[PDB]
């Protein structure tokens, strides 16, 4: 009905410069409800399960260690139609093909080292919520 | 010549959270001239005259009371080519079909409860100025 | 009980550069309630009544015309303990004796041309509300 | 040596309006290092242990439920001389005795419902880190 | 390899209102490296060489003196793929055909008096770097 | 009369993180006039002349190389009563003895590595203008 949850995590590239701000600011500007915010140094198994469909890539081996090197912050948000709303908030993957006024279109430099990853589909979010955010760790209201 | 006036009013949905700020900020940053700013609890006749062409709508009855429930703020602005400039500043009606970096594309959630209404055309503005903003209540310079 | 109203008006010196923004932003960020916002080109009688106790001043004649030259914006706000809260928000009259992070301590240059005037006391506000803001023009909630 | 940790938690009063932003922004502006960020609905035992020295207060019973009503967010930060630096960042308890440009001096309204609580002393932080933030849940670097 | 330099200068129209900020902010928000920042009152020979290919224009005579009247600020930036990045950062020349969230799409009013000019191509920058920014006046790192 | 010039330079510590923004923003918020902005890698002679009265200090040798290691940006500003106005804008040297809402009171961590240096007195500015900012490189208006 109105329990659309979206998993979004900030890659360590931004947290090196911090810049965690203005993200929740944009989220509340749109008017979304925070449901959870937990950050942990995810182990290699979690990273490979996150990109199990992307393992057969030469860049997969590089990224699975590059993002592992620094600490990472994960977050889940609740809102109506938040699916694809987060996507349009971020912007398309390629920095060149990313208009300003967005997240990916105003901060990222290269596809190799981006800052934000998210759920492409509701079905993807249905597993991006689990195995990293343990249950009964959120708020329902 | 250069007397293009545009009537723009903030619906009570935003004033519930306030958030009246940054609007005049964007207007002055673009470089528009304020001509008037008056707010009143508009009566039902004013609301129905505002949407006389939209009366034959099932959603009209709901909105004409929903926006009447809270207090509203109205505003008029003077600037060159401000017509359709305000429109591109806000964004298209549907929140999904509204890119970020705008007004309607960064704050609104659903078409039912939006925050900003404006003049689609110059002819529309020619009556949106009147019957709510009483004359000799503005500044010409 | 909780009906503390404060009259605050922005002098034309700032409206020349606009800069009306961030004021309502600070007010809502503190958590005050807007009760009214009307602006008019005040006549000489209104200005002299505003400073009837300051008429016997050589600078009074200069200011009563300098601020009259441009348009002015007046505003009233409702909040608990807003009295002297607005004062500490603005800062002491002399720009030199005004710490940063405030209104008067971050924008004003000289005592001759300031941007904001306010109510020193509750009794002062009891008349600063009237004779400029006509009654039944506010919102009680 | 350089492992000064400070426990700071945002009370639900602000999270009702969100406003979690700009806090990490100020922290990175000063140049502090984030060490942990976890939020949970703290049980009554945690709240009473937090204010064990304040239990013999009539206001204690009210606050221990008022802050429990909504969800709360806790946070720990690492930085040199962060002790009393967080304190001067927030401001003195009474909103009246709190200059602007701070946290407590720019957001809070009344002593009854504040938004931020922190560690008065290093010894206080030595227990404010524990019993809420479980160990091996932070980052050392 | 990674020595892509772009010459960008702010026309005096903005410097009349200042507004030099939020420009470098976006550059560091994207994460570009500053290589040089010098401002001088450019002489007519410098101005005509800047628009040598635009001399045969009726508007050329007007613009060459309009921006000459006030002081101008020039700047050069270093970054990967910086070319066409500033171009999309500003926006297309016509203010009407310029979406918000950008520089040209959020500040300029008319094509006659814009605020920012830049290098369309790398080859254009290869002469825009010289004859205004004297060599050995930058930083390589 | 009204030609009060103040020399202010940003140390490389901040330029490592950039953060050059918001400084000109505060300056225009107060309403000061920019007169010059030039940045160069100052040689050792310039640095020792800058602190000729501070040479007989053990920390002098460390700082004269620490600030020389990175590039530095210098700036001069024109405004009425700008003397000691810049000082109150920055804040007292010790970060602990520096209230928030300022420059030194919101960014600096330790006295060893600060970000901003300025002119204590008008007489000091009378030489801080020269020997670094070459004459006929400013704007008088």
- Chains with at least 3 CB pairs less than 8 angstroms from chain B: A, C, E
How far is the alpha carbon of F138 from chain E, nearest alpha carbon, in Å?
8
The two structure tokens encoding residue D120: 């008065």
B26 part of contact set with chain E, CB < 8 Å? yes
Of D30, D84, D89, the CB nearest to F107: D30
Residue C104, in any domain of the structure: yes
How far is the alpha carbon of B39 from chain C, nearest alpha carbon, in Å?
7
B71 part of contact set with chain C, CB < 8 Å? yes
Q: What residues of B are labeled active site? A: 117
Give CA–CA dist C19/C115, Å, rounded. Answer: 10
Give CA–CA dist E36/A127, Å, rounded. Answer: 48
B107 part of contact set with chain A, CB < 8 Å? yes
Alpha-carbon dihedral sign for residues A107, A110, A116, A118: positive
Q: Is F78 helix (H, G, I), strand (E, B) or coil?
A: strand
Q: Is A59 helix (H, G, I), strand (E, B) or coil?
A: helix
Expressed as residue numbers, the domain containing D33 is 5-128
How buried is residue C69: exposed, middle or buried, by Cβ count under 10 Å (0-12/13-18/19+)?
Answer: exposed
Q: Is C126 helix (H, G, I), strand (E, B) or coil?
A: helix
Residue B134, in any domain of the structure: no
Give CA–CA dist E31/A107, Å, rounded. Answer: 7
Of D95, D100, D110, the CB nearest to C102: D100
What is the structure's resolution, reported in angstroms to one decimal?
A: 3.8
Give CA–CA dist B57/B59, Å, rounded. Answer: 5
How far is the alpha carbon of D79 from chain A, nearest alpha carbon, in Å?
14
Q: Which residues contact C123 (CB under 8 A, 6 or more apart)?
A: none
Give CA–CA dist F14/D28, Å, rounded. Answer: 12
| Rounded alpha-carbon distances, angstroms, from residue E30 to A15, A109, A110 | 14, 7, 11
Give CA–CA dist C85/C73, Å, rounded. Answer: 20
Give CA–CA dist D126/D76, Å, rounded. Answer: 11
Give CA–CA dist F9/E28, Å, rounded. Answer: 19
Site of tokens 């994207």: E30
Does residue E131 contact residue E49 with C-beta atoms inside 8 Å?
Answer: yes
Give CA–CA dist A26/A23, Å, rounded. Answer: 5
Q: For D32, which residue in chain F has the nearest alpha carbon?
A: F109
Residue E135, in any domain of the structure: no
Count of CB pairs separated by less than 8 Å, A with B: 28
Check contact B-F (3+ Cβ pairs < 8 Å).
no
Site of tokens 């508009």: B42
Residue (of F54, F74, F58) closest to F11 by Cα position: F74
Which residues does chain C have within 8 Å of residue F102's beta carbon, measured at their own beta carbons?
A: 100-101
Of B29, B80, B99, the CB nearest to E106: B29
Of E30, E79, E80, the CB nearest to A106: E30
Residues A94/E118/F35/C111 CA torsion (nearest 10 deg): -60
- Chains with at least 3 CB pairs less than 8 angstroms from chain D: A, C, F
Could you give the angle at the alpha carbon of A68 between the alpha carbons of A67 and A71, nearest 5°? 90
Query: HEC string of C55-122?
Result: CCCHHHHHHHHHHHHCCCEEEEEECCCCCCHHHHHHCCCCCCCCCCCCCHHHHCCCCCCCCEECCCCH
Does residue A91 contact residue A103 with C-beta atoms inside 8 Å?
Answer: yes
HSE on the CB side for A134, CA within 13 Å?
5
The two structure tokens encoding residue E32: 């570009």
Phi, psi (deg, nearest 5) at residue F39: -130, 135
- F38 forms bridges with which residues in the sheet? E38, F74
Give CA–CA dist D33/A17, Å, rounded. Answer: 10
- F34 forms bridges with which residues in the sheet? F77
Cα distance between the two ends of chain C = 13
How buried is residue F18: exposed, middle or buried, by Cβ count under 10 Å (0-12/13-18/19+)?
Answer: middle
Residue (of B141, B115, B119) closest to B130 by Cα position: B119
HSE on the CB side for F29, CA within 13 Å?
20
A48 part of contact set with chain B, CB < 8 Å? no
How many distinct structural domains can be found in chain C? 1
How far is the alpha carbon of A16 from chain E, nearest alpha carbon, in Å?
12
> Cβ F101–C96 below 8 Å, yes or no?
no
Check contact E-D (3+ Cβ pairs < 8 Å).
no
Interface test with D, best of F18, F91, F98, F100 (most D CBs within 10 A): F100
| Rounded alpha-carbon distances, angstroms, from residue A43 to A12, A71, A124 | 14, 11, 20
Give CA–CA dist D59/A72, Å, rounded. Answer: 40
Give CA–CA dist C6/A77, Å, rounded. Answer: 39
Give CA–CA dist B50/B66, Å, rounded. Answer: 15
Residue E137, in any domain of the structure: no
Query: HEC string of chain B?
Result: CCCCEEEEEECHHHHHCCCCCCHHHHHHHHCCEEEEEECCCCCHHHHHHHCHHHCCCHHHHHHHHHHHHCCCEEEEEECCCCCCHHHHHHCCCCCCCCCCCCCCCCCCCECCECCEECCCCHHHHHHHCCCCCCCCCCCCC
Q: Give me the CATH number covering residue B29.
A: 3.30.70.141
Does residue D49 contact residue D131 with C-beta atoms inside 8 Å?
Answer: yes
Give CA–CA dist B141/B34, Å, rounded. Answer: 10
The two structure tokens encoding residue D19: 């406003």
Chain-centre distance for alpha carbon E137:
18
B31 part of contact set with chain E, CB < 8 Å? yes
Count of CB pairs separated by less than 8 Å, B with C: 41
Residue C27, in any domain of the structure: yes
Put simply, the chain B residues between 75 and 104 with a CB less than 8 A from any chain A CB are 95-96, 99-102
Q: Which residues contact D32 (CB under 8 A, 6 or more apart)?
A: D77, D78, D79, D82
Does residue C77 contact residue C98 with C-beta atoms inside 8 Å?
Answer: no
Residue F137, in any domain of the structure: no
Residue C141, in any domain of the structure: no
Phi, psi (deg, nearest 5) at residue E62: -65, -45
Q: Which residues contact E19 (CB under 8 A, 6 or more apart)?
A: B29, E107, E115, F28
Q: What residues of C are labeled active site? A: 117
Residue (of F66, F49, F78, F81) closest to F12 by Cα position: F66
Residue D141, in any domain of the structure: no
Q: Experimental technique used? A: cryo-EM
């Amino acid at each position: 009905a109105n329990c659309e949850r979206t998993f979004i995590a900030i890659k360590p590239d931004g947290v090196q410069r911090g810049l965690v701000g203005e993200i929740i600011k944009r989220f509340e500007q749109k008017g979304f409800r925070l449901v959870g915010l937990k950050f942990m140094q995810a182990s290699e198994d979690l990273l490979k399960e996150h990109y199990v469909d992307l393992k057969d890539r030469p860049f997969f081996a590089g990224l699975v260690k590059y993002m592992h090197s620094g600490p990472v912050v994960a977050m889940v948000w609740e809102g109506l139609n938040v699916v694809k709303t987060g996507r349009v908030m971020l912007g398309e993957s390629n920095p060149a093909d990313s208009k300003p006024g967005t997240i990916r279109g105003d901060f990222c430099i290269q596809v190799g080292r981006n800052i934000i990853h998210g759920s492409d589909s509701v079905e993807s979010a249905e597993k991006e919520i689990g195995l990293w955010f343990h249950p009964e760790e959120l708020v329902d209201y």
